[PDB]
Design a protein around this ligand. Structure first.
Ligand SMILES: [Mg+2]
Ligand SMILES: [Mg+2]
Ligand code: NA
Length: 328
DNA sequence: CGGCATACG
DNA sequence: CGTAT
DNA sequence: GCCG
């Protein structure tokens, strides 16, 4: 009764197995810090299965037959059910390796590979990094300078104000262009780590060259604390007003032609695991290649036209899920 | 055993 | 290498 | 780590 792919089942934002899923996601995260992408995926998928269940798991036998639960994930749940704590998870939580890799990778501009190299070099704290700034990229310097603000959750109230200022710049850059809120906020989240916007124009081709024009206008308004600058994705740090002051917020802007908009909307609305699972399903079950630009039939050498996300779910033979049920 | 999503800056 | 869902 |  539980499908194996996350894109085959509704996953709401809030659910009935929060503690169990959080523990499995610690193990997934730790696996990623060690470069074990397969184990990360299994632990993520097992966590996501629990998010999709209609009620709390209370007994080990209720895991029988659930996809992605084998010996290891089942033992984690067993210990949580019997003792309220899983020793492996707590050992990860406490470990110097986990805590430092988490600290470093949550810096904008630092990935697993950089964090691991720093860790092996003996570095452990943000002030350790600040002491040797000549070794930092410009992006990393911005991520470290703004780290405290970027660690503060963005609220849904922040988003409306941001969208208005982005729309103002977009309308001067290209009248008629539109701004759509994507990412976690479109899936119903009340907070987030950043704000994701997708920009298009109803006349195919008019969006070409748009993002530089948008960025130059936002920068002229004094709103851009950091950006990387032809391009179509911008990973920015914005200045957001606050009472008597302001705070730094991560904002991502993406431009797509209207022909690709349903694919870009689907991709950028996520969740990350949902999209990985959807692309895996498309290729492995349907023989079609999915990305944020389109859906390709490699036998006919043709792209599927889509006018809506609904079209895309139909072309993959999947029941439609609204964004609020893509919280895999 | 192979496979694990797929892009752009 | 980083970034995005 | 788990699936097919
Ligand atoms: Mg986001
Ligand atoms: Mg983002
Ligand atoms: Na990072």
């Amino acid at each position: 009764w539980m499908p194996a792919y996350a894109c085959q089942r509704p996953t709401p934002l809030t659910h009935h197995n929060t503690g169990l899923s959080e523990a499995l996601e610690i193990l997934a995260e730790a696996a990623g810090f060690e470069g074990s992408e397969g184990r990360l995926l299994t632990f993520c998928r097992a966590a996501s299965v629990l998010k999709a269940l209609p009620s709390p798991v209370t007994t080990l036998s209720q895991l029988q037959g659930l996809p992605h639960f084998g010996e290891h994930s089942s033992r984690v749940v067993q210990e949580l059910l019997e003792h309220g704590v899983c020793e492996e998870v707590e050992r990860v939580r406490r470990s110097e390796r986990y805590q430092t890799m988490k600290l470093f990778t949550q810096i904008f501009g630092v990935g697993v590979k950089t964090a691991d190299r720093w860790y092996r070099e003996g570095l452990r704290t943000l002030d350790d990094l600040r002491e040797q700034p000549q070794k930092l990229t410009q992006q990393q310097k911005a991520g470290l300078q703004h780290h405290q603000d970027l660690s503060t959750p963005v609220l849904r109230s922040d988003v409306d104000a941001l969208q208005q200022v982005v729309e103002e710049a977009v309308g001067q850059a290209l009248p008629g262009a539109t701004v759509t809120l994507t990412g976690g906020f479109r899936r119903g989240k009340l907070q987030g780590h950043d704000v994701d916007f997708l920009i298009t124009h109803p006349k195919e081709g008019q969006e070409a060259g748009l993002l530089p024009r948008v960025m130059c206008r936002l920068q002229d308004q004094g709103l851009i604390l950091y950006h990387q600058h032809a391009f179509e994705r911008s990973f920015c740090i914005f200045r957001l007003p606050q009472p008597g002051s302001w705070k730094a917020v991560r904002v991502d802007l993406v431009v797509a032609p209207v022909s690709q908009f349903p694919f870009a909307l689907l991709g950028w609305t996520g969740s990350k695991l949902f999209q990985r699972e959807l692309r895996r399903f498309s290729r492995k079950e349907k023989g079609l290649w999915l990305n944020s630009h389109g859906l390709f039939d490699p036998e006919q050498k043709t792209f599927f036209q889509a006018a809506s996300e609904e079209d895309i779910f139909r072309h993959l033979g999947l029941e439609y899920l609204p964004p609020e049920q893509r919280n895999a």
